[PDB]
Structures are given as C-alpha cells and as structure tokens.
Amino acid sequence: NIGNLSAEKQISLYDGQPFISEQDVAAGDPNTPALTIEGPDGYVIAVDAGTPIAPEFRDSNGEKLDPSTRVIVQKCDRQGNPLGDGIIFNDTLGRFNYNKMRTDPDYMRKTAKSLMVDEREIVKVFVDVPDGANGYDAERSRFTLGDDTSDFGKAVEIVDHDDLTEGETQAVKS
Amino acid sequence: NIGNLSAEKQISLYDGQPFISEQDVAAGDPNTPALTIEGPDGYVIAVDAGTPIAPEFRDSNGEKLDPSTRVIVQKCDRQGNPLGDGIIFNDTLGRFNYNKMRTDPDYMRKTAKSLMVDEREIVKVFVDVPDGANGYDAERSRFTLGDDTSDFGKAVEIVDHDDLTEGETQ
Amino acid sequence: SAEKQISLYDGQPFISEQDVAAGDPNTPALTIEGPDGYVIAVDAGTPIAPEFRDSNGEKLDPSTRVIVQKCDRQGNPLGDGIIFNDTLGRFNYNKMRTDPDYMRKTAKSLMVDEREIVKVFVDVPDGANGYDAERSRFTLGDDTSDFGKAVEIVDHDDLTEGETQAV
Amino acid sequence: QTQEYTLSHTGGLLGSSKVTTASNQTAPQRETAIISFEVPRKFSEIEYVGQRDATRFVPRTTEEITGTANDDTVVQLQANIQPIAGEEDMADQDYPVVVAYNVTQGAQVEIADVNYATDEVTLATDPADGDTVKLWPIMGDGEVQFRLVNQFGQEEGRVYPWATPLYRWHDFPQLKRGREINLHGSVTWQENETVEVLLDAPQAITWEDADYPEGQYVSTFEQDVEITL
Amino acid sequence: QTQEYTLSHTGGLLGSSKVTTASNQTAPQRETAIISFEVPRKFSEIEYVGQRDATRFVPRTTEEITGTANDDTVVQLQANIQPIAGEEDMADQDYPVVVAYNVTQGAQVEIADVNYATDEVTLATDPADGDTVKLWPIMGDGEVQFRLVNQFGQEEGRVYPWATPLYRWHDFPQLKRGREINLHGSVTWQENETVEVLLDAPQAITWEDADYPEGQYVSTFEQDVEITL
Amino acid sequence: QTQEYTLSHTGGLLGSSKVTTASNQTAPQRETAIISFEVPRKFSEIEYVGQRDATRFVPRTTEEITGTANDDTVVQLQANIQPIAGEEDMADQDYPVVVAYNVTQGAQVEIADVNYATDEVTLATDPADGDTVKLWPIMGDGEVQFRLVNQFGQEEGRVYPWATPLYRWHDFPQLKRGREINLHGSVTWQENETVEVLLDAPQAITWEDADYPEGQYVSTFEQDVEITL
Amino acid sequence: QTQEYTLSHTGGLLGSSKVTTASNQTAPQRETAIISFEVPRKFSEIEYVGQRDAT
C-alpha cells in the first residue's frame, strides 16, 4: 500500500534538472542569464513570500566570484522578454557564506515576495560581474530555491494543471 | 476526389518512428527500458481491452534472447516516473513463436486492459534478462502494438486533441 | 477490480523448490504456499508448463510422472482434492507453450486460502537421471493470451465473503 | 454497373501508355514516384477503398558483383533482408528473398545459406575471376504512400497521410484471407485524374533488367479496384 | 502493537540475506539501485512516513593514487566536496569529509589542508615512488529517490516523485532535533514487497573495501521505521 | 468423490505388483495379453469411458543385426513402418519411428534415410564386422482390444467387440484436442476385478531391454480414468 | 494581442535554428524546398493571408 497524496507537492529546485537550463558567462556582461528556468507544460509552480536560495556561483577554478558581483533573479513572460513588474532577489554575491548558509536558519536568504509560473513562463538569473574578473562556469557551480527536506525552511509548491478549476483564472493572471 | 475521414485514425506503432525512442540493454538490468514511447502534443492515442504485440527482442547475433526473459509494458506519467496501477503485458519471452504470431489469430497475444495516453505521457518496456544471455540490441529487433492492415486484429486509435468536445475531459 | 489475472512460475518468493533423486516420489520438487492476505483461485481448466529437465538440460524419461496435489496445513498431502495426474513424456514443450490444443488444463477447480500448501510430486521410477530445478521451470496460467485461462488472485482485505472462503 | 477489377505494373487495362514505371532517388532520399495510374479513354471513374480492398507489392533491387580466382562465395548487401512469411528457408518462402544470375555463364546461381540479419549471404557455387553476377534481393526499410493529381500536377493532397513500411509489407503473408492487406483511404478519380504511388527509401528499385530470369519483371505492384464499368 | 525500530546497511533485522548492497552505474548515469529492504519471514507490515520519520546516509567513493620520488602531496578529485555541518575544519566536521590510507605502509595518511571548492587536497605526509594510497572522499552531486516492488519487479511506482540531492544531504547537520531530515512520503509494504533506494549520479559509491580503517564499512544508510511487531 | 487420474505401464498407483507387462505370441498369432490392471488394496472402483476418456500407446519391437567388414548401412524389417503425425522426417515425427544402438560401441546409431513403405532403412554410420546393433522400430499391423476378469479368469466378456489397428494408432496424432483418441466402451471394475489389454499381431513387442537408451522403457501404454477416490 | 511582424531568410525571430536554407534539384526538375519556417519556442500561432499580406 501507498498513502494518497495531494496535487500540491513540496520540492527544491537545482541545476541538474531537465527543464531548467544554464550557460557560462563572462565578466562585464550582466544581461547574459546563467540560469533559465522554464515552465513545464501542465505544471504550475509557486513560491511564497520567502524561500531560500543557494546562489552558488563559482569560478572555473572553483572559487566564488568577486564579492562585488551581483545576482538578480527576474521573472519573464514568453518572448524571452525580461520584466520589471515582477522581480525577486536583487542581492550581491560575496555575502552568503555558502558553507553554512545552505543549512542555518539565519544566513538563509529568503525572497522579496511571492511568485507564480504558468505552463510556459521563464525566469532568469542575471549576474553582474563588474569587469576584468574571472569568468563564470556552471559545472563548478550550483543553485537552489527551496528547503523541502527540513522542518523550519520553506519549499517550492508544484501542482499539475489538470487537477484544478482555477487554472483559467491563474492563466488570466499570468 | 478524396474521401472524408474521421479524426479517429487506425495505425500501428513500431521502432522506426520519431516520437518513440529506444536504447540498448544489458543482461540483469530490468529497470533500463528498451522502448520509451512519448505522447505527442495535441495527439491522444488509445488502446482497447486487447491489441496484439509483436515483441521482437533479438540478440546482437539476431537471435531471440532466453525464454526465461520477461517483458513488461508499463504506463508512466511525465517525469519518466514508473507507475504500477496501470500496467500491461506481464509476460515471458519464450512463448511467442514470432514468425507466426505476427499473423495468426491463435498465436496472437493481446493486452490486459485498455489504455489512454495524453498529449505527453510515457510508456516503457522493461526487459528482465535474468542470466546467461547476450547483450540486447535494437537494430536487430522490432516491436509493434496493433494490426491495422489485417481484418481480425485490432489497431491503435489516434485522435487530434482539437477535434473533440470531450478531449479536455480525457 | 480486486480480481487480477496472473501466471505463476519458478522464480518467485512464496513458491519453493528442491532437487530430487530417482525413485523418490514423496519428495516434492515444488512447494507452493499461500501468502498472507492473498487468496488465489484456479478454474476447472488452466495451462501448465511442466518443464522438468536433467542437470544436462534434458527432459527426463517419458515414464516419469507428475502429480500436482493440494495440501492443507501440517505439510500434509490430501487425497480428496488433487489436480493433474499425468506423465512427463507427453508435453512437447516447444509447442505446448504456445498452441491452444497442445495446452493442458486442470482436472477441476481449486482455491488456496492464506495458509495452504500445494505440492508437485515427481515419480521418476528408476534407472534415470536425477532432477535439477535451475535447469527447469513451471507455470500455471496464460493471462497474456485470449483463448487461455489464468490464475485469479484476490487480496483478502477487500472482501466480506472471506470467512466463507475460510470455511 | 459497378464491377471489381485488378491492375498491374504492366499494361492490362492501360496498354502500357496510361501507366508508367520509374526508379527512385537514392543519394538524397526523396519520397519519389515509381508508378502511376492514369484513367484511360473509357472509364467514368475508379474507386479505391482501404479496409475493403486488397494490395500486393513485391519489390526488389539490383546490384553487380564480380568474381575472383580465389572467389569468396560470400556477399554483403546494403539493403536489409527479412523473410516474407516465416522462416528464411528459401525452399518455402512463398517466393525467394534473393535471386542471382551469372552473366558469363548465362545461368542461375543457387544459394547455400544466408547470414540472416547480418545482411550477408553464402552461395552454393564458385564464381570465376572477372565473372559478373547480378543479384535481386528484396527491398526493405522504406515507406510508401498514395496521392492524386488534378489533371496537371496540382495535387489534391494524399489518400491517407500516414505512411507504411516495406519490411512490414514483406512480413505480412500475402495470399491469406484476413491476413491480407487492407490499408486506410477512400477515393475516386475520373478521366486523367491520375494516381501516383510514392516511395521514400535509400535504396533503388528495379522493374526490369532484360536479364532477370523469372519472367521479364523484377518487381511488381498489383491491386484490386471497384470500377464503374 | 506498533513499535518504532531502526534499520541499517547491514544485517540487523534481516540477517544480511533480506538486504543487499550494490554499487551504481557511472559511465551512463542511471538512477540505479544500491540498497534494498526485503520484508523478512516474520513481520505483518512496515511503515515509512516522511515528515514524521528520520533518515541518515553517509556516502563515500573510492579511488587509487600512486606516489612518486618527488611526490606531490597534492591531489585533485572528480567528485565535488563540501563540508557537512559548517566549516571545512577536519577536526570539527562531525565526521571527516576525506579518509586516506597508504597501502605499502599499512597506516593512515593525515591531511594538512584542503583546496575547498577547487576539489583538491593537500596532505600532511610524503608518499613514496610507486606507493599506493586509497582515498574515500564523500559523495555529492547526485539525486536520490525511493520506490517499491510488487514481489516480482512490477513497481507500484515511487514514494514521492521529486528527488533530493546529496550535497544538500551532507549540508543539513544530522544529529539535531528540528534540523533532522524528514522527507515526504507515506507508504506500507508487507512480506516480500521489498523497497529499493535509488541513486542517480556520475560517481561511484563504496560500501566496503576490506582495507578501509574505520570500521569495515565505508558508507552507510540508516533509517527509522514504525513496524507492526 | 470422483476424481480423474492417469495410469502407466509402470508402478504409479499399483507399485509394480498390481500390474504386469508381457510379450505376445508370434509363431501362432494369438490375441494374447501384454498388460493388466489389477485394482489395488484401496479403491472402491474404477471407470473407463470411451468417447469421453483418452489413451496413449507407443509400441516398439526389437531385433539384432550384426555387421560386416564391407558393412551394408542398409537393413530390411519384417514389421511394416509408417509415420506417426505426417511425414517421415525423423527430425519432426513427434517421436522417432526407429531407434538404433550399437553394442560394441556403446553409442547411438543415427539414421540417414528411410525406404519408406519398402520397410527398409539406410543408416548414417558404418558398423564393423561382427559388430552387434539393436533396433527398436515401431509396431504396426496388429489389433487391440480390452476385456475383463471376474477375480479368477472367468471373463465377463469384452468392452467393445470390435478391434482397433496399430498403424492407425500411430497415424492419429496424439497430443491434440479433438484429434485425441476416444474409443467406445463403458465399464467399471472393483477390487481384484482386473482388466487386461489384448493384442493380436505377428510381431513381438518390447517393454524393456536394459540397453535401450531413451529412458529404460522401450514402449509404453498410458491412459486416463475416472476413479471413485 | 495580434501584432504584425516580418520574417527573413536569416535568423531574426528564429535564431538560424528554427529556419533553414537550401538549394534545389536541377538535373531532374523537382518542386523541391529551399527554405522553411519552423515556429520557435514561444509563439501560440502564426497567420498568413494572401490578398492582405505582402512578400
């Protein structure tokens, strides 16, 4: 036997997934997104007001980039188009204290507000390296958005679009 | 002139199609599926309570693997996630007599029950090669799911998702 | 539904087996045994694949015999209730696994409660090769096919006639 | 006034003028045409109905193989081979899957054994140095469709959009009720509304060579129809 | 008659016969199985409940490193390293992230310093030419899931469809109330309805080597359960 | 309390004491007995019903053939041979119509070809001068009947007065529903009311030789019954 | 939400991956293809209307 479950499911995203995408980045090119999250078909996801992030963004040589580096998470509709109305987590890089901030409640950096993502809506991770620094690599890097295993932290909430009657409403929301 | 046709169309699946997938397999590895069918977008398909299969599964040397081998058709939602409630064709290999069973009614072997596949769901063919067998290959093998050319055997039922009024319900 | 159509064989947990020597019909080569909360059922006719070969992968002497037999608890054979008294030198394995008419149906129906044994006694009379199981197999059903029958398993939890089937 | 009839790869109801045969494109695979069916002078219409009407199609290719002093007896083919109805036992295939013919010796070349899915063959005889042989294995690994023409080349479209494969074609035993072929489609075409079969495959095709032993025609297509007189 | 209990990577309630251990596939990454849990002879059922029940899993890999006359003291690893609970200070990691052992000298090999995210290490000692050393860093950059079996291999499916990563696993400090792990899922399995953990990662895993110093078992998995007797 | 069961030419439900085997009379053809069926200690009764119940009977004879320096490879037999189910192709007879065994070389003797209705055979091998070979062709050209005994030898009579031939017996393929045998007759016999099969033929019969290769028993008879416990 | 746009033999709204160019067959004249237009990742649909639209 297995216990029944709701459509709502509590998860934590990261790099090595199919629907997410990434790419390397060079210094002084903030408009290049190093991560491109991308709505799966028939799967809405949701983020409440505060959820952790593990912005692990290191060098080719396995070193966190310059502390003057900055990270900007940002919502995007289709058309590959950024958007100002809707944006999360404008912050620096050399602040997080990686080794513990994936763990402790206190370091743990939550979002600015909530979010919703229809069956195809994009999110991007712009990375402002100032200039003349070391380039970015992804294989020596990670990223996350949730704390689903633990008991104090929050997690990302996924739902299958078929299991709702308000899907048209959220589609109008966009 | 050409005749009108319904949205329902009668086909038969096999290896050399694009949306289907496959791979090679080693002995003693059931959970590595040899065939991975994936739902196309805006195309539901359907299978009634019984439809033939031609589970051709031969060797690199073009030889059918051991009779103790077993085949398992299995339904899956997306994420490549296996699923039990929903499963077809729990069978051994050494039972078909390929060269006749593709054709005859008595040697024919239908499914367990019906099935439906949304715009994207997965179906997997797991293959328990227990022991003492050669590595499986696919180019020396084929597969089917229906008999549409014939006049007694059943066939798959494909539909474009737009033509229906109950297509959203299914 | 609660009913399910299956087909048994050697490589399963609840079933058991053992090697056998010549002239020892009381040694069962296969021992089926009721799991807990899983009743099964066999109608009046169902296939069998009585593959029973030698160490050297050869069907034993045609004068060999197979006797399927029901057993209650106590590891005890039973006379009232018996299926498939037959020889060995009869099946023509390679075809009988497939054809509808080389196929072989039981004598009568059967039920197996949560703890009831079935045995497959094998009369190798004499002057023969010893039996091995690893070079041998067995079945009881063809659920895959159409013309043929299969074993009907049910979980005891989903019933109200469970007490009647226990009587 | 509706009567069933049969067509052919040759003449018949068309005099070898309202029909043509043709090879295919190989280097670029193209869904080319090999055969047409023009309505002749007389008829009011023709009708095809898959799921009611039959079909037969026996395709073979061609090659050229030399010989050697220390001749090989063995060949490989870049055209996948299968049986037709059952085993690969050339005695009982319902028609052979390979034909061979020596050119120097104007005589057949019998087969000893086949490397089945390897797509190689062993022969019975011993060819000679510089001796030419022509083979005619069957054709597999290729699609087929039907379509139509509006008296010019403006296609109406196609009978049934989905294709059909030829290894499968060989596989289903012809000549057996129920096990016959009955495709899907339902059409009609009047005078000069010609039909054209189409094929997409790497390999060639062969209708004639004038040296093929068995009856002047390497391949064939044959078909049933329901005609209005 | 419900009592909580604990499982192990070894024996215990299973006698090392109703449990197995196994490595994984590396060259093709596959979500393979490393460990099972067969119900033994006795029990009526077993229950797991994420969000109520705990878990522990300490995975390590293996390699082989020679030495040199002008030995390096320095190594690189194709397996990303992180701390466990806090800093990378080997004195106070709550268990080391690396273990080393010289083979010629049947003795430990202590560490001086770690190149942290570079995934390189400096050692304390000086190996010799042709001298073998075995390492056991921890395993990161890999998923994990649970599933179930219907007495054959027919999977019911999976406990909870979404995976969990192992660098994260190390990150959360085990051994602290609230900071413990409690996954999501709720299941039950009776006799011979075995469970199997699954892992998808590039790198290998190691359960035993017979030369690992610290207690015969390179890795472990341990777990809480609620059993009906 | 009626359950179907099976009998044999050996032991089984009789312990090889309530059954016997026997050869026949040849020089004067006599409708002799070869096999009996005594009710054993236990049963209340036994029932046979032709047109409901089955039967199997595989009879073979024996001879002795020497060899020669310029050995023959060829033999003739005074016992007419036929196939069993179809052709005389020893590969696919459903059991051979001939068996052979050299005595000096304790080994089989394989067959090359059969002179079919001539009742002669060609062998594959070359026997030696003074070398002995034992053959076991099948038995044809003979009748069969059933009868009954009243605890002494006073026959009740016979089951069904008309006989049945053995070439016909071989001809009908055993092992096929509908094509099975179902004779005519309906009987019952209690304790010590033994049954005896009867055979009238010129040729001998063989149950055992202790040198026959295939399973200690040259021939067999097997049968279905409906027993009251 | 309908807006007019323009296409090209190169890139543009397709990144030179959802479009291809190609030569033609000459020795046998064939009504071959030279250029395609695959819908890219994003759009819901595209519309062409002769007697309204240009080329």
* Helix/strand/coil (H/E/C) assignment for every residue in D48-82: EECCCCCEEEECECCCCECCCCCCCCEEECCCCCC
CB E85 within 8 A of CB E173: yes
D186 interaction partners in chain B (CB closer than 8 Å): 2-3, 5
- Of all helices (H) and strands (E), which one includes residue G11? none
Separation between Cα atoms, residue D10 and residue A21, nearest integer Å: 59
Q: Does any CB of chain D come closer than 8 Å to the CB of residue G52?
A: no
CB C10 within 8 A of CB C3: no
Asked if E190 and C13 come within 8 Å (Cβ–Cβ), the reply is no
What are the structure tokens assigned to A117, written together? 């993502």
Q: Distances from the Cα of B94 to the Cαs of B79, B106, B129, D44, E16, in angstroms?
A: 32, 16, 12, 55, 34
> Which residue in chain A has the smallest CA separation from B168?
A162
Separation between Cα atoms, residue E146 and residue E197, nearest integer Å: 5
- DSSP code at position D216: S
Helix, strand or coil, per DSSP, at residue D170: helix
Backbone dihedral region of A96: left (phi > 0), alpha (psi from -120 to 50 degrees) or beta?
alpha
Separation between Cα atoms, residue A111 and residue A74, nearest integer Å: 11
Smallest Cα distance from D67 to chain G, Å: 34
Q: How do strand B156-160 and strand E55-58 relate by DSSP bridges?
A: unpaired
B1 interaction partners in chain D (CB closer than 8 Å): 148, 156, 187-189, 193
Cβ atoms within 10 Å, residue D73? 14
Amino acid code (one letter) for B31: N
| Sequence-ordered alpha helix ranges (H) in chain F | 166-171
Find the CB nearest A1 among E86, E118, E188.
Answer: E188
CB F20 within 8 A of CB F199: no
> Which residue in chain E has the smallest CA separation from C14?
E192
Asked if B90 and C144 come within 8 Å (Cβ–Cβ), the reply is yes
Residues of C with CB under 8 A from a CB of E: 12-14, 35-37
Q: Find where tokens 């290719």 sit.
A: D61
What are the structure tokens assigned to A99, written together? 């080794």
C35 interaction partners in chain E (CB closer than 8 Å): 191-192
Neighbour-count burial of A143, counting CB atoms closer than 10 A to its CB (0-12 exposed, 13-18 middle, 19+ buried): buried
Q: DSSP string of E118-175?
A: TTEEEESS---TT--EEE--B--S---EEEE--SSS----BSSSS---HHHHHHSPSS
Separation between Cα atoms, residue A20 and residue B61, nearest integer Å: 41
CB C68 within 8 A of CB C118: yes
Separation between Cα atoms, residue C14 and residue E46, nearest integer Å: 19
- Of all helices (H) and strands (E), which one includes residue E40? none
Neighbour-count burial of B161, counting CB atoms closer than 10 A to its CB (0-12 exposed, 13-18 middle, 19+ buried): middle
CB D81 within 8 A of CB D137: yes
Q: Distances from the Cα of F60 to the Cαs of D6, D36, F23, F80, F136, in angstroms?
A: 57, 65, 11, 11, 6
Separation between Cα atoms, residue A66 and residue A129, nearest integer Å: 8
User: Which chains are within 8 Å of B by 3+ CB pairs?
Assistant: A, C, D, E
Cα Rg, chain D, nearest whole Å: 19
Smallest Cα distance from E152 to chain C, Å: 7
CB F209 within 8 A of CB F133: no
D149 interaction partners in chain G (CB closer than 8 Å): none
- Of all helices (H) and strands (E), which one includes residue A171? helix A167-173
> Which residue in chain E has the smallest CA separation from C7?
E152
Asked if B3 and D182 come within 8 Å (Cβ–Cβ), the reply is no
Which C residues 69-88 touch B at CB under 8 Å? none
Q: Does any CB of chain G come closer than 8 Å to the CB of residue D184?
A: no
How far is the first Cα of chain D from the last one, in angstroms, to the nearest whole number? 6
User: Which chains are within 8 Å of A by 3+ CB pairs?
Assistant: B, E, G
B85 interaction partners in chain A (CB closer than 8 Å): none
Q: Distances from the Cα of E76 to the Cαs of C165, E65, E80, in angstroms?
A: 67, 10, 10
| Sequence-ordered alpha helix ranges (H) in chain D | 166-171
Q: F with B: 3 or more CB pairs under 8 Å? A: no
What are the structure tokens assigned to A88, written together? 């999360």
Disruptive mutation site among G26, G29, G30 for chain D (greatest number of D CBs within 10 Å): G30
D160 interaction partners in chain B (CB closer than 8 Å): 5
Cβ atoms within 10 Å, residue E174? 19
What are the structure tokens assigned to D113, written together? 């054994």
CA dihedral B94, B98, B103, B106 (to 10 degrees): -20
What are the structure tokens assigned to C130, written together? 């010893």
The residues facing E101 across adjacent strands are E108, E134
Helix, strand or coil, per DSSP, at residue E19: coil
Name the experiment that determined this structure.
cryo-EM
Asked if B82 and E161 come within 8 Å (Cβ–Cβ), the reply is no
Separation between Cα atoms, residue C31 and residue A22, nearest integer Å: 58
D25 interaction partners in chain G (CB closer than 8 Å): 28
F6 interaction partners in chain C (CB closer than 8 Å): 65, 85-87
Q: Does any CB of chain B come closer than 8 Å to the CB of residue C2?
A: no
Smallest Cα distance from D141 to chain G, Å: 23
Helix, strand or coil, per DSSP, at residue C144: coil
Find the CB nearest E157 among B30, B83, B126.
Answer: B83
Cβ atoms within 10 Å, residue A132? 8
Q: Distances from the Cα of A123 to the Cαs of A14, A79, D69, D162, F184, in angstroms?
A: 13, 12, 72, 39, 86
A5 interaction partners in chain E (CB closer than 8 Å): 160, 186
Smallest Cα distance from B4 to chain E, Å: 43
G30 interaction partners in chain D (CB closer than 8 Å): 30
Sign of CA dihedral E150, E27, E24, E97: negative
Q: DSSP string of A62-122?
A: S-B--TT-EEEEEEE-STT-EEEEEEEEEEESTTS-HHHHTT-TTT----SS-EEE-TT-E
Cβ atoms within 10 Å, residue F33? 16
Which residues precede gaps in chain G, with C-N > 2.5 A? none
Separation between Cα atoms, residue A54 and residue A101, nearest integer Å: 8
HSE (side-chain half, CA atoms, 13 Å) at D47: 13
- Of all helices (H) and strands (E), which one includes residue D195? strand D195-199
What are the structure tokens assigned to C93, written together? 């394995």
Burial state string for A144-167 with b = 16 or more CB within 10 A and e = fewer than 16:
bbbbbbbeebbbbbbbbbeeeeeb
User: Which chains are within 8 Å of F by 3+ CB pairs?
Assistant: C
What are the structure tokens assigned to F86, written together? 């179809």
Nearest Cα to Cα of residue B117 among B21, B2, B39: B39
Q: B with D: 3 or more CB pairs under 8 Å? A: yes
Q: What are the φ/ψ torsions at residue C148 (nearest 5 degrees)?
A: -90, 170
Which residues precede gaps in chain F, with C-N > 2.5 A? none
Separation between Cα atoms, residue F30 and residue A76, nearest integer Å: 104
Asked if D178 and B152 come within 8 Å (Cβ–Cβ), the reply is yes
A42 interaction partners in chain B (CB closer than 8 Å): 78, 120
Disruptive mutation site among B53, B66, B104, B106 for chain C (greatest number of C CBs within 10 Å): B106
- DSSP code at position A172: H
CB A167 within 8 A of CB A43: no
Separation between Cα atoms, residue F114 and residue F103, nearest integer Å: 22
What are the structure tokens assigned to C124, written together? 């190798």
CB E201 within 8 A of CB E24: yes
Amino acid code (one letter) for E195: V
Separation between Cα atoms, residue A115 and residue A108, nearest integer Å: 19
Backbone dihedral region of B56: left (phi > 0), alpha (psi from -120 to 50 degrees) or beta?
beta
What are the structure tokens assigned to B79, written together? 């994420």
Nearest Cα to Cα of residue D226 among D1, D9, D12, D2: D2
Backbone dihedral region of G34: left (phi > 0), alpha (psi from -120 to 50 degrees) or beta?
alpha
Find the CB nearest B87 among E148, E154, E158.
Answer: E154
For residue C78, the Cα-to-chain-centroid distance in whole angstroms is 15
Asked if C63 and F8 come within 8 Å (Cβ–Cβ), the reply is yes
Separation between Cα atoms, residue D30 and residue G27, nearest integer Å: 14
Smallest Cα distance from B6 to chain D, Å: 11
Domain boundaries, chain C: 1-167
B84 interaction partners in chain E (CB closer than 8 Å): 148, 150, 154-157
What are the structure tokens assigned to A46, written together? 């949701």
Asked if B82 and E32 come within 8 Å (Cβ–Cβ), the reply is no
Residues of E with CB under 8 A from a CB of A: 49, 80, 82-83, 85-88, 115-119, 141, 143, 148, 156-157, 159-162, 164-165, 167-169, 171-173, 178-189
Helix, strand or coil, per DSSP, at residue C61: coil
Smallest Cα distance from C4 to chain B, Å: 10
Asked if C143 and B112 come within 8 Å (Cβ–Cβ), the reply is yes
How far is the first Cα of chain F from the last one, in angstroms, to the nearest whole number? 6
Resolution (angstroms) stands at 3.7
Smallest Cα distance from A79 to chain G, Å: 6
